[PDB]
Amino acid sequence: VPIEKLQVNGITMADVKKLRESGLHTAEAVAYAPRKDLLEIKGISEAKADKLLNEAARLVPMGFVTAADFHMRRSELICLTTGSKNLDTLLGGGVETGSITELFGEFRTGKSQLCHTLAVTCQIPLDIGGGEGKCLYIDTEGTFRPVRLVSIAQRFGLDPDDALNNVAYARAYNADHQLRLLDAAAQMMSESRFSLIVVDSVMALYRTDFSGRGELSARQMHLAKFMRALQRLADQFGVAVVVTNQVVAQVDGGMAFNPDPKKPIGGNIMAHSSTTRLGFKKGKGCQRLCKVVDSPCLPEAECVFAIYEDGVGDPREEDE
Amino acid sequence: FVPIEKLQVNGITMADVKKLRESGLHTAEAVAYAPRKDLLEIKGISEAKADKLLNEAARLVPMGFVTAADFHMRRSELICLTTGSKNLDTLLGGGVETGSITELFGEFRTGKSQLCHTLAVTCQIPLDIGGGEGKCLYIDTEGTFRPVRLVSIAQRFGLDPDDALNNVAYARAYNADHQLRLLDAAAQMMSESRFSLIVVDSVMALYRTDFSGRGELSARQMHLAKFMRALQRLADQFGVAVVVTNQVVAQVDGGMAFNPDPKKPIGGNIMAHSSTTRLGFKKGKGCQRLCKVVDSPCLPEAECVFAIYEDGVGDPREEDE
Amino acid sequence: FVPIEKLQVNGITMADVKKLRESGLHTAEAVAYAPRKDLLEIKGISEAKADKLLNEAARLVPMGFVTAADFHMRRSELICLTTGSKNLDTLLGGGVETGSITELFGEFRTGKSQLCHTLAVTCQIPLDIGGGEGKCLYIDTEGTFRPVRLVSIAQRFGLDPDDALNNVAYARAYNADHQLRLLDAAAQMMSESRFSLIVVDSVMALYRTDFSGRGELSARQMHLAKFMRALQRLADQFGVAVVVTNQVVAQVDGGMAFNPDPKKPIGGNIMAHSSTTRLGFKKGKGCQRLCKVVDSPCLPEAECVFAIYEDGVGDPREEDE
Amino acid sequence: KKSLKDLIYETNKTFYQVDSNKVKYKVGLSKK
Amino acid sequence: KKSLKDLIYETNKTFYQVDSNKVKYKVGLSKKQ
Amino acid sequence: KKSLKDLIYETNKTFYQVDSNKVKYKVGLSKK
DNA sequence: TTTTTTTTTTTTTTTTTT
Ligand SMILES: Nc1ncnc2c1ncn2[C@@H]1O[C@H](COP(=O)(O)OP(=O)(O)OP(=O)(O)O)[C@@H](O)[C@H]1O
Ligand SMILES: Nc1ncnc2c1ncn2[C@@H]1O[C@H](COP(=O)(O)OP(=O)(O)OP(=O)(O)O)[C@@H](O)[C@H]1O
Ligand SMILES: Nc1ncnc2c1ncn2[C@@H]1O[C@H](COP(=O)(O)OP(=O)(O)OP(=O)(O)O)[C@@H](O)[C@H]1O
Ligand SMILES: [Mg+2]
Ligand SMILES: [Mg+2]
Ligand SMILES: [Mg+2]
């Protein structure tokens, strides 16, 4: 629902322009905005803020809904194809749009390769698990290689010229720059149809920008705002969010039940924000192991997938 | 890049730039990439002034989005430093990539230092033969830098030995604090002349003994992460190629046996995630060595054989075959 | 070097200097190379005082950059001590190199200690004949030091036997802690008289028994790293050559069959990475022995033949041929 | 329909006042 | 054009307030001593 | 020209509080 | 009331056949 539909009952273009400059680009963003934030920006009074919230609630649902209708709506969710049948069956169809999906594991386990694969499969038609939408790639490590996209695009039949022309790439140099890029992302997604958001990675910059134990409170609080912004992007536009994460070795040997001496970075802020978490491990040669650590509905399981020149796919008999 | 002197606009005085230079920021890119919190610790920098600095710097340095087509065009113009070996050049897809960190790890006498010495010469030869037409900066922490090797290698590529030795800045680090401090001095040098390569050899040698025991492990890892982040910023600011070598340790806990290699590199997860490309070196027969790509975002996991000769790293010869 | 008394500028008094000396710092270079953490551990030293010392030391000792052309000229004037054999010197390209650590490993009776006895005399002869014109310091961890060998060797080189014996300092280590603590006393004698060689024979003799089982393996290797780091600092401050011997053990596993040598040095990866030049020793026919260059930053892999006589290490004779 | 290049160009203009046709990404030492 | 050596001089001057013409690297024992 | 013998004497008491002239070094059983 | 981090490290030979 466009934000311009609020041009009724005394709200003029001047107020909407102020809302646009404050980071609100859709009617949903106004509706979900707490009353405190509306009063923070200048040019809007208490009467205007109450009018905006009442008008926004008229175009955006806020009431109750039966579980039967909600189940019917979620059965029409678009699941982006991952390119591998093993992962597609494991996740019940693949990466689900409108929710946060997190990937963590040791290096060379294929987290970035999957993100490159999804960046191409989000443009193929819906009949083959696509999204028919553009992609947005925010890279905080400087490891975005467009040469991978061309090789993958040929496999799926896409024109390499168009595949590179439908992907937007940005690099974040600091935590403040990383958060501000989402504000620019909101404007872009409000003009053209997007279907995927990729952050690679999340904790790469927060690890170094905030140094010491005294800044742990600030570090975790800034991270909470980033995930809140990411969830708002999925709510307003429905685009899938895929974020990657590193791992850290637990030096404390007090517990030994877990065979993995490595745990994801982020703490409970990361663990509670992510709807779905996947753990990656290295197998034989090109093979890798993916395990669903946490998910509200998918059972805990495991599968095997392989990294190939054309992207991520099921392991072949040659590897077997 | 963008000179820092271009920011003297809209009330920015001489002292403002001088204070920034003393704080380690020497390019308009550096101030643009610096977080707002970091700019606040400089004395004489106000709340309003810091915001003005960020806005002006962002006007000269790109911060927005770009189509993957345009970034693909720019990456196709990237200069790759030749390694002197055709087998190794093909393995890396052209040579050592500029604007990214390459990590070499392995056992001893595996040729890590020999490769770095060869790159110090190949960074000065003209572009058409795989060079970069620049100078080299060689930061050393173990005391194993020999200008004798550069004399032999420079003769192979047609370079004058005196000129080759006059375009390589050398500096030795003696502790972790000195190792990080040398980077600020490098940035000032790099902003006044064209550099194309910087070498740290090796990284974890000093960190192993400066931090002792499990009680100082957390402090050691965080100090290392600060050093690696500073190295990455140099690549973004100036576009040069960073080469860092690493040592190896033999794992003792035989709980896992899937990996045939019982040796792993020093650094933990901080070093593993920081490096863009990692190469593993092993000894073959005689003067031959084995190279294998371990981690790379755009290179398949392959293996190639290269040999070390008195004129530098080269392809294996039929005499050894 | 630069005496530590020259730091008596800008609020530095006897008490500040005396506290530093008791902590193991005896030269200006020792203060400069020391990290900030170590200086803060010394009682009576404040953060303001510690930072002042670093600034003063940096202005006195070279802590900055240099061109590789100048470093080449500096290394061309380096003193190399003859080993008593023309074949050994030619293979080493001059002899044992001062300012670096040289490691000798092999079986028993191969000739590791005999070479060290020869080096203990060649370090006193004048520079014109490959000497060092300085005293030697010998640390023995096995009780195998024999001054009788020095007397016969000194007669060959024409030195006065009384003067030869009076220019060598001998100490014996009984445990790993005692061995490391001997280095602190060694440093003090360095600052008061001219020495030219450090010999440790052997390094891993006491580490093998003082640490038992895989439980103490981590502690054993960490202690060894500190010992080798201290040896490196001695070469940096004073320029004395460091020669260390080592023992070998058999390779029970036959997987590494591609290496004809079934024995490897003791010390793990820390010992291998710390040494600058490694030399292997094997027994030849009769009194002849074989020496091989295993790892070196600037020396190609090659072998040579030397012999052991009454008057020390020398070239093999045609009579033995 | 707007091309992505022009859509990106306007977004950079309205957020940084940067002429996207003159200020471009650079990745390393270029061959020109 | 300014040589690299010259460029080394000012940088050492700026950071360490030291004259590189007075202090130089010494890598061991020199024959000239 | 501090003889090595005297220099060693100073070092021992500095580090060990031992009179070197009284506490000598023994290699084993001696005929004395 | 708030709110986690982070890996190290190799040992060491046996034993004639007719
Ligand atoms: N073109 C290619 N063909 C085949 N395999 C490839 C190709 N490019 C990369 N790989 C494989 O992918 C690996 C890199 O994995 P990936 O880039 O996804 O890392 P990651 O899990 O995101 O880790 P990190 O960011 O911590 O380094 C390489 O080590 C290699 O095995
Ligand atoms: N002039 C030369 N000619 C031929 N080969 C040489 C020459 N100099 C060195 N080498 C070879 O290179 C080896 C040294 O390798 P190098 O010092 O680069 O290894 P490294 O991995 O850096 O070692 P370290 O762990 O000690 O730092 C020698 O053992 C020898 O085989
Ligand atoms: N006076 C001498 N005259 C001739 N040869 C001698 C003399 N003394 C010793 N040797 C030779 O030197 C050998 C001892 O070598 P050396 O003491 O250097 O061995 P090493 O490698 O240090 O061994 P270890 O492991 O026992 O310490 C003897 O076996 C003998 O061959
Ligand atoms: Mg990655
Ligand atoms: Mg090396
Ligand atoms: Mg011996």
Residue numbers in the entry:
A (entry chain B): 81 to 400
B (entry chain C), C (entry chain D): 80 to 400
D (entry chain H), F (entry chain J): 121 to 152
E (entry chain I): 121 to 153
Direct quotes from the study:
Rad51 is an ATP-dependent DNA-binding protein that forms extended right-handed helical filaments on the 3′ single-stranded DNA (ssDNA) overhangs that are formed following end processing of DSBs. The Rad51 presynaptic complex is responsible for identifying a homologous double-stranded DNA (dsDNA) sequence that can be used as a template to guide repair of the damaged DNA, and it catalyzes a strand invasion reaction where it pairs the bound ssDNA with the complementary strand of the homologous dsDNA, resulting in displacement of the non–complementary DNA strand. Rad54 binds to the Rad51 presynaptic complex, drives the ATP-hydrolysis-dependent movement of the presynaptic complex along dsDNA during the search for sequence homology, and it greatly increases the efficiency of Rad51-mediated strand invasion. Rad54 is a required cofactor for Rad51 strand invasion activity, therefore, Hed1 binding downregulates the activity of Rad51 in meiosis by preventing interactions between Rad51 and Rad54.
We obtained a 2.8 Å resolution CryoEM structure of the 39 amino acid residue Hed1 peptide (residues P118 to P156) bound to the Rad51-ssDNA filament and 33 of these residues were visible within the structure (residues K121 to L153). Similar to Rad54, the Rad51 binding motif from Hed1 bridges two adjacent Rad51 monomers within the Rad51 filament corresponding to a buried surface area of 1,494.4 Å2. The ability of Hed1 to interact with two adjacent Rad51 monomers provides a structural explanation for the observation that Hed1 binding stabilizes Rad51 filaments. The N-terminal most portion of the Hed1 peptide is composed of a short loop made up of residues P118 to S123, followed by a three-turn alpha helix made up of residues L124 to F135, and it ends with a short loop region composed of residues Y136 to P156. The C-terminal most portion of the Hed1 peptide is composed of an extended loop-like region that interacts with the second Rad51 protomer via electrostatic and hydrophobic contacts. Hydrophobic contacts include Hed1 residues V138, V143, Y145, and L149, which interact with a hydrophobic pocket present on the surface of Rad51 composed of residues A137, V140, P141, M142, G143, F144, G318, V319, and A320. Three additional Hed1 residues within this region contact the second Rad51 protomer: K125 makes contacts with Rad51 residue D149; residue I128 is involved in hydrophobic interactions with Rad51 residues F144 and V145; and residue N132 which makes hydrogen bond contacts with the backbone amino and carboxyl atoms of Rad51 residue F144. The Hed1 and Rad54 binding sites overlap with one another, such that the binding of Hed1 and Rad54 would be mutually exclusive, providing a clear structural explanation for prior single molecule studies showing that Hed1 acts as a competitive inhibitor of Rad54 binding.
